[PDB]
């Protein structure tokens, strides 16, 4: 159950309904299957002030390799890696 699963992704807000995001889809999958809910860890780097995040779900870790303009945006990209690497739907129009 070790290691980190990764992809190069960014969250594109106009590709989803304003009120249904990847973080919320991931939370609903955890409720349905009675798993512990997700834990995020987010950091900002001094080189260029961008953010990156890692999410832990069911003892497995997931991360995007790109950096983005806010904590919220980084956290949404982490959620996408978790869902898309597993073939789960993520809310796209
Ligand atoms: Cl959450
Ligand atoms: Cl934002």
Author numbering: 349 to 441
The authors write:
However, this belief has recently been challenged by the discovery of a dsRBD serving as a major tRNA binding module for human dihydrouridine synthase 2 (hDus2), a flavoenzyme that catalyzes synthesis of dihydrouridine within the complex elbow structure of tRNA. Dus2 is found in all eukaryotes and catalyzes formation of dihydrouridine 20 in tRNA. However, in stark contrast, we showed that, despite the presence of a HD domain, hDus2 and by inference from the sequences probably all animal ones instead use a novel extended dsRBD version flanked by a peculiar N-terminal extension (NTE) and C-terminal extension (CTE) to provide the major binding sites for tRNA substrate. By solving the crystal structure of this dsRBD in complex with a dsRNA together with extensive characterizations of its interaction with tRNA using mutagenesis, NMR and SAXS, we establish that while hDus2 dsRBD retains a conventional dsRNA recognition capability, the presence of an N-terminal extension appended to the canonical domain provides additional residues for binding tRNA in a structure-specific mode of action.
Mutation of the conserved residue, K371, reduced the binding by ∼8-fold while that of K419 or K420 by >4-fold respectively, demonstrating the importance of interactions engaging both α1 and α2 helices. In order to substantiate the idea of a synergistic effect due to NTE, we tested the effect of a double mutation in the canonical dsRBD. We chose to produce K419A–K420A because of the important role played by these residues (see above). The double mutant led to a ∼17-fold decrease in the apparent affinity for tRNA, rather hitting for an additive mode of action of these residues. Similarly to R361A–R362A, this effect is purely attributed to loss of positive charges since the structure of K419A–K420A is similar to that of the wild type (RMSD of 0.6 Å over 82 Cα).
